[PDB]
Design a protein around this ligand. Sequence first.
Ligand SMILES: O=C(CCC(F)(F)F)N1CCC2(CC1)CC(c1ccccc1)=NO2
Ligand SMILES: O=C(CCC(F)(F)F)N1CCC2(CC1)CC(c1ccccc1)=NO2
Lengths: 191, 191
Amino acid sequence: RSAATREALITGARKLWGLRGYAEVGTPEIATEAGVTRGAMYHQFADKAALFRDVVEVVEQDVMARMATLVAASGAATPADAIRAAVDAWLEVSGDPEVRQLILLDAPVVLGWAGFRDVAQRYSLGMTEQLITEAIRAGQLARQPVRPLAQVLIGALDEAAMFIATADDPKRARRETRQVLRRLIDGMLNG
Amino acid sequence: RSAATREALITGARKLWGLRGYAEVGTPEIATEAGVTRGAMYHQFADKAALFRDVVEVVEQDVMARMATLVAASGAATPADAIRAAVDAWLEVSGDPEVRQLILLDAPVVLGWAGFRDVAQRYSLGMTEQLITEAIRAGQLARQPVRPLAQVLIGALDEAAMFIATADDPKRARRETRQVLRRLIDGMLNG
Ligand SMILES: O=C(CCC(F)(F)F)N1CCC2(CC1)CC(c1ccccc1)=NO2
Ligand SMILES: O=C(CCC(F)(F)F)N1CCC2(CC1)CC(c1ccccc1)=NO2
């Protein structure tokens, strides 16, 4: 009931901000797109940023599900290959124009640096730790504490995507950044 | 005269916000600390955040000077060694409680994402590109476009420092993150 109003607001905001950016669409337009009144919207979300926070949750969940799907489909036969495929999967999902606009461009502004990292952490860490733990167990990555490596890799990957997202030639940035990420990955991976 | 008032406000704000955080010290207390009136302060800085921006400039300049000093003192004889020493120097300068409070914690909040990145870029990028260009010229790092590598390393290094700054056991986080960065560096450096 209130749940339905929330879902419709989230879906509408996600679509519209996905196309034009956070800064460019006001809450009244989103309400109308969702078919709810300003009163019903304000009951669910005190302000714009509160709606954005729930939009980021749904988008990041879908980012993580899409990553798992691409890693499972990549045909990686070793943990090392799976790490390589995960890097490609992120460059692929981060290039989706909605993910680019909402996560790479709008979320660092609206949530701050700490808020963005918090979101990135909660969604990304588990899978990152997992892939690391598996390469280690297979002897393909030197034995280490998992959390610090995970954190650095996440920071490097999030920054890679941002650099592609704002570059004048996205196509060249993506290719050159992929090479960079490859070398950095291949420098810690054994074989 | 008013120049002196500017310097004393910057020095006082830097010290006090360094110790207690931006949010915890008001402009009246900083005026008093510097021995100047509210009207002299307001003549130099329209508001609190304007003062903070100048504080960030002097602190980031000192971050960069202290990094150059640590790299020059390491006795690095090759570009590779200089990259190794620069990584250590950043973890060391990052861990200064004033740098931690003003740059890592307060600046993202007060400046906003775009403003903070802009500042971090202007102070970091030049030196990062330089050390990369030198390792390449020496044959110690594979020939590649400089900007993408620079940006990924910056993202990894900024995230390393953030993780140390907010970790439960900062001392263990620093040591383990340093090891991680060393492996990652040693994997790409030919020498
Ligand atoms: O969802 C995010 C970031 C979301 C954001 F909100 F911060 F933007 N990802 C980046 C990190 C991951 C997941 C996707 C993990 C990963 C990986 C690759 C190789 C070895 C270990 C982990 N690649 O991408
Ligand atoms: O000032 C900042 C960051 C400011 C922040 F606002 F983002 F926090 N620095 C981080 C990156 C640098 C310089 C200092 C670059 C560097 C290095 C080391 C090895 C090879 C290449 C570059 N070490 O630290």
